[PDB]
Design a protein around this ligand. Structure first.
Ligand SMILES: [Mg+2]
Ligand code: NA
Ligand SMILES: [Zn+2]
Ligand SMILES: [Zn+2]
Length: 336
DNA sequence: AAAAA
DNA sequence: TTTTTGG
DNA sequence: AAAAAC
């Protein structure tokens, strides 16, 4: 059948038969992100995403016929990999000094595009030279990023994610006993690793005040146990944390783990769950499909119909998919 | 960079 | 061709 | 301004 240009109309499981092509496309996309070429970045991310959905490996140029998001530039890259098993374009990016510096600097929690560019233009090339510099001033986020660097750069596995789930649930039910805690992100899509562990917290009986106070109560509780290594609460309501995960719950005997908690009103739980499950590409295409194909607006809180001038209600992800005129895609099929 | 407008 | 690309 | 998210 006809492969859609939208990730939300494709089933993308973790069994990628085209990793040789998508690893090269992911490097080219990352370079364009670093060079602030948003458009070329998006074109390589879409091409990589569509190849990830294929139930077979590309073995010839003829196999690319009728596949969307594969223009002339992308087909040249695929042709080159079929030729000798390597991408000369991706190899050049991997050896580029700006690309190497941007990957290294942005690997620090609290360092993005602007700070990485600033440090590179100052002549810095290593994290050791940045940390030991007497003139540089670091944000509270960067201080935590450097202090827990080794732990944060190693990836979180499923036993660790589960151990964190237990800590989150134990803390949450202490203040809201009827609260529902769901692991979202990559782990909900079936990944066996991740950079962090994400949770959606919601309560069917909590008041507007109770809902607002929960993340402050849970983080104060952890601060008292000496488990809160970093905390930033944002406006729903969410927090970006670093938690101390003791070895015994799954050297120094503990591991720093990046955790994100999202508190949402009970009614909006389907929109939040859908938004936080991801992948990033699946979310982008859901919103793009809603706008361009249905004249609808979708976000983590709601679904709005621009023609009917009404907000559409949903108690489940299935209901959101049905409002959009999409076949339901399971979370493990959203790895776009 | 690719597809829609 | 010019505009959009999550937002 | 910057970073943090899927
Ligand atoms: Mg995650
Ligand atoms: Na970063
Ligand atoms: Zn996260
Ligand atoms: Zn909204």
């Amino acid at each position: 059948k006809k492969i859609s240009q939208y990730a939300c109309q494709r089933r993308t499981t973790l069994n990628n038969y085209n990793q040789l092509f998508t690893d090269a496309l992911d490097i080219l996309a990352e370079n364009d992100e670093l060079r602030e070429n948003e458009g070329s970045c998006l074109a390589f991310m879409r091409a990589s995403s569509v190849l990830k959905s294929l139930p077979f490996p590309i073995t010839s140029m003829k196999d690319t016929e009728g596949i969307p998001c594969l223009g002339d530039k992308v087909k040249s890259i695929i042709e080159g990999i079929i030729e000798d098993g390597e991408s000369s374009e991706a190899k050049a990016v991997l050896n580029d000094e700006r690309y190497k510096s941007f990957k290294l600097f942005t690997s620090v929690f609290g360092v993005g595009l602007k700070t990485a560019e600033k440090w590179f233009r100052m002549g810095f090339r290593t994290l050791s030279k940045i940390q030991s510099d007497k003139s540089l001033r670091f944000t509270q986020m960067q201080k935590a990023g450097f202090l827990y660097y080794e732990d944060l750069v190693s990836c979180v596995n499923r036993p660790e994610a589960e151990a964190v789930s237990m800590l989150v649930k134990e803390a949450v039910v202490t203040f809201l006993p009827d609260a529902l805690v769901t692991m979202t992100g990559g782990f909900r899509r079936g990944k066996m690793t991740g950079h962090d562990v994400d949770f959606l917290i919601t309560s069917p009986e909590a008041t507007e005040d109770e809902e607002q106070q929960l993340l402050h109560k849970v983080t104060d509780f952890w601060k008292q146990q000496g488990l809160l290594l970093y905390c930033d609460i944002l406006e729903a309501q969410k927090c970006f944390l670093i938690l101390k995960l003791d070895h015994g719950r799954v050297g120094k005997g503990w591991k720093a783990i990046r955790v994100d908690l999202v508190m949402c009103p009970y009614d909006r739980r389907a929109f939040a769950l859908l938004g936080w499950t991801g992948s990033r590409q699946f979310e982008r295409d859901l919103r793009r499909y809603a706008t361009h194909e249905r004249k609808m607006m979708l976000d983590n809180h709601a679904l709005y119909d621009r023609t009917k001038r009404v907000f559409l209600e949903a108690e489940s992800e299935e209901e959101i998919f049905a409002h959009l005129g999409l076949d339901y895609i399971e979370p493990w099929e959203r790895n776009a």
